[PDB]
Amino acid sequence: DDEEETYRLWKIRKTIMQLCHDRGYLVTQDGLDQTLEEFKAQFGGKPSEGRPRRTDLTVLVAHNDDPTDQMFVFFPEEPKVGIKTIKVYCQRMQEENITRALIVVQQGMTPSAKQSLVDMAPKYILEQFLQQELLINITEHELVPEHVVMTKEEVTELLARYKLRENQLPRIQAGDPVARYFGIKRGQVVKIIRPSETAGRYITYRLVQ
DNA sequence: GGCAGTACTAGTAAAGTACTTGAGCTT
Numbered sequence: 001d002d003e004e005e006t007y008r009l010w011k012i013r014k015t016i017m018q019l020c021h022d023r024g025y026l027v028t029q030d031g032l033d034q035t036l037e038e039f040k041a042q043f044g045g046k047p048s049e050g051r052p053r054r055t056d057l058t059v060l061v062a063h064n065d066d067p068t069d070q071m072f073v074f075f076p077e078e079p080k081v082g083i084k085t086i087k088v089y090c091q092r093m094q095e096e097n098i099t100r101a102l103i104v105v106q107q108g109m110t111p112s113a114k115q116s117l118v119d120m121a122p123k124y125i126l127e128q129f130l131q132q133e134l135l136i137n138i139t140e141h142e143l144v145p146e147h148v149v150m151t152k153e154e155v156t157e158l159l160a161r162y163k164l165r166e167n168q169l170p171r172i173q174a175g176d177p178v179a180r181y182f183g184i185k186r187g188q189v190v191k192i193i194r195p196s197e198t199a200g201r202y203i204t205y206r207l208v209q
Numbered sequence: 210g211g212c213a214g215t216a217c218t219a220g221t222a223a224a225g226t227a228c229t230t231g232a233g234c235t236t
Contacts, residue, residue: 082236083236110235110236111235112235112236
């Protein structure tokens with residue numbers, strides 16, 4: 001029902017605000033924590049023939065270092081999406097000059113649309129998110145340790161300390177849901193901090209390939 | 210004384226996985 005659908009959209013928006021917060025983009029403390037009834041009073045209850053149409057849930061956010069980069073979050077209204085639709089989205093992207101955006105897909109993507117997401121690396125990068133993947137925050141699960149995406153200088157000092165080539169580190173594939181969660185690209189290194197029952201804390205470094 | 214036939218001696222035929230493949234559905 002519209003109560004269930006609205007509750008889903010609340011989960012999704014909140015989880016995407018946690019996404020946006022973990023990537024270092026400016027988020028007010030209210031944007032992270034919205035009680036369901038405050039969200040409903042804002043966006044008006046029922047989606048079906050209702051106030052939220054899945055449009056105006058779109059999100060624009062700015063980076064802490066520079067305001068220019070920003071970001072974007074689309075919510076498509078179609079069950080499945082295609083090259084023409086994404087092409088409209090990238091038209092809005094080039095209209096606003098914002099480089100980075102997301103897409104929350106209700107069901108699936110035609111493979112030509114995925115390939116069309118991989119087509120253009122430099123101009124605009126788009127990341128497919130399924131609707132369910134944002135219905136839960138996996139970083140807050142007990143098994144998933146704290147991840148910290150390392151800057152290039154910290155990576156250089158790291159490889160200087162242990163005298164390591166980049167190939168000799170353990171790896172984490174770019175299709176890993178956590179790597180998606182932080183929006184990580186090939187060649188970056190992630191710093192996992194996990195508690196151990198021998199030392200009490202242990203640091204892993206996973207190269208992204 | 211010669212020819213034919215027979216015999217003997219010397220070559221000679223549970224489950225579980227990955228992988229692939231065919232079909233079925235879409236730009």
